[PDB]
Amino acid sequence: GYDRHITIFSPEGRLYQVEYAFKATNQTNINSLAVRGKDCTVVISQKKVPDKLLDPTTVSYIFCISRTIGMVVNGPIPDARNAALRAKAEAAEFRYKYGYDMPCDVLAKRMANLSQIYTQRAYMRPLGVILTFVSVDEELGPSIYKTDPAGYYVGYKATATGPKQQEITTNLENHFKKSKIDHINEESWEKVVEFAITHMIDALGTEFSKNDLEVGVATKDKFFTLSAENIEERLVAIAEQ
Amino acid sequence: DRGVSTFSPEGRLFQVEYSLEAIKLGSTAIGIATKEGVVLGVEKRATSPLLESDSIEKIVEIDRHIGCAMSGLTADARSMIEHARTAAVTHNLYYDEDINVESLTQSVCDLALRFGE
């Protein structure tokens, strides 16, 4: 039974190492969510600092890949940082060679192709991570593209990742069935973040303090992460209506 | 299977210990050192009477002042002899002298553990 140790086909036409890499994805026990506004793309993720000895400012699963592209990871931090460093390198090289900023979907495809290689080549293991890339593309507008250990990737209206992804997914599905549009009809990104947090609260059934969340926002020509105090202001506005 | 350069639990290299068993199956060779000279003798051990025994070469010259006898898988010795002869002649070229018997032996033994994967 060595067909379960390396990335070769089983008799059922399955790749067990790829399937087990999907299971490593939920090892951190963190849930993430991404949604699109009119002018922006918002990504939120649970933040858990169990140890008091930890410096909470360094605990993060959201990455600034380029000025325009942000990436949230679902999976162990070593593999997460591996993917982040590579994506940063690829994004920089793209700009140098082709003279314009790498689009979100193109980076996603590139990382997906790299992941595909690990599913075909034996000496390389898959990374146990799911990469969610977000930006406001200059052609396609607000964009969410997600990659997994199988090498699969696709664009999204909205998306969710983690142990309780299905609860979040259905919650978002039901909202877009009502509104009958592919995004959050809202002008400011602040209110889109408020929507994202509100619908995660409803889906998970848990309340959040300022230190329980982590937020990333993509606007035209820049991606940035919110501080604890920026999130607190967001939580106050939600509670007051 | 298992590594070629693997240690046993007793602290011995499996492959080295197994090669020693192959040498025990080989034909006998004897050497005696005296103050008047060193004598080397071997058992030829022909597998059949039709085999011309004088073609069995188990005693071999390395240089004018160094000889060699072998026992075991004798085909393996050819590259060792070639190295020894080259080492002996090369040293004479570099230093205009005969090479010490110990130094020659050390050069041959350096090849021994150059095996792996």
Binding site: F9, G13, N113, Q120, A122, G151 | -
Partner: protein, 250 residues
């Protein structure tokens, strides 16, 4: 480090079977149904856009891909494997042909190059076979219209019409009854939509179906005027609306 897997991971078993190729074909069997039909004045290729989530934008995922202006491809099996094959196929069409002869390769020779890449993954060191079967439709001046299937082994066969993946056995039977040598392109598209409806469970419309044709030259899609000999690509992907129009006359 170093790739120390320099040995074959696909080997003959006592019965003469190449296990990894068989298992790759099993992965293709599980894949979504895709088909191809050849007409007198064109070729059609089609498949279902099996969306993994309703939040996912299925337009961003292209199962039917342009390889050259006159050649297209569709698959069944593992999507990621297909994606990299298309990248390699597009590149080899340039490096091993267009940069030499100054023109795009004929269908059969591009298929031959793709087949070669898939064969090498079946024999080279430290790799598994590709878990896909391709259907490649195309046109060229001297061979006319043509449709080829390519398997994980690297084997390829030309077809008048065929289907691969989930419900291929039933779909091939359906095509045998309907196919003839006097079919026009519109008739082939009609038959393609009928055949594909049998294997689809849920929604059946322009948004859940992906369909492209190799037909007449499209000067409107060329992007420039001023060269009479350049008349445009024969490959065209049908729009969501264009599919729905033909579903009313179904």
């Amino acid at each position: 480090m170093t790739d120390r897997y320099s040995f074959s991971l696909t080997t003959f078993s006592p019965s003469g079977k190449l296990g990894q190729i068989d298992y790759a074909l099993t992965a293709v069997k599980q894949g979504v149904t895709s088909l191809g039909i050849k007409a007198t004045n064109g070729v059609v290729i089609a498949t279902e856009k099996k969306s993994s989530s309703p939040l996912a934008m299925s337009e961003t995922l292209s199962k039917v891909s342009l390889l050259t202006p006159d050649i297209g491809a569709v698959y069944s099996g593992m999507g990621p494997d297909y994606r990299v094959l298309v990248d390699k196929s597009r590149k080899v069409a340039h490096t091993s042909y267009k940069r030499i002869y100054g023109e795009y390769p004929p269908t059969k020779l591009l298929v031959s190059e793709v087949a070669k890449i898939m064969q090498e993954a079946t024999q080279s060191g430290g790799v598994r076979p590709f878990g896909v079967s391709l259907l490649i439709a195309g046109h060229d001046e001297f061979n006319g219209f043509s449709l080829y299937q390519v398997d994980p082994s690297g084997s390829y066969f030309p077809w008048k019409a065929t289907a691969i993946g989930k419900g291929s056995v039933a779909a091939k039977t359906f095509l045998e009854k309907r196919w003839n040598d006097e079919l026009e392109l519109e008739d082939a598209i009609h038959i393609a939509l009928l055949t594909l409806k049998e294997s689809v469970e849920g929604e059946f419309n322009g948004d859940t179906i992906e369909l492209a044709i190799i037909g007449d030259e499209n000067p409107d899609l060329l992007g420039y005027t001023g060269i009479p000999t350049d008349k445009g690509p024969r490959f065209r992907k049908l729009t969501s609306q264009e599919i729905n129009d033909r579903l009313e006359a179904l």
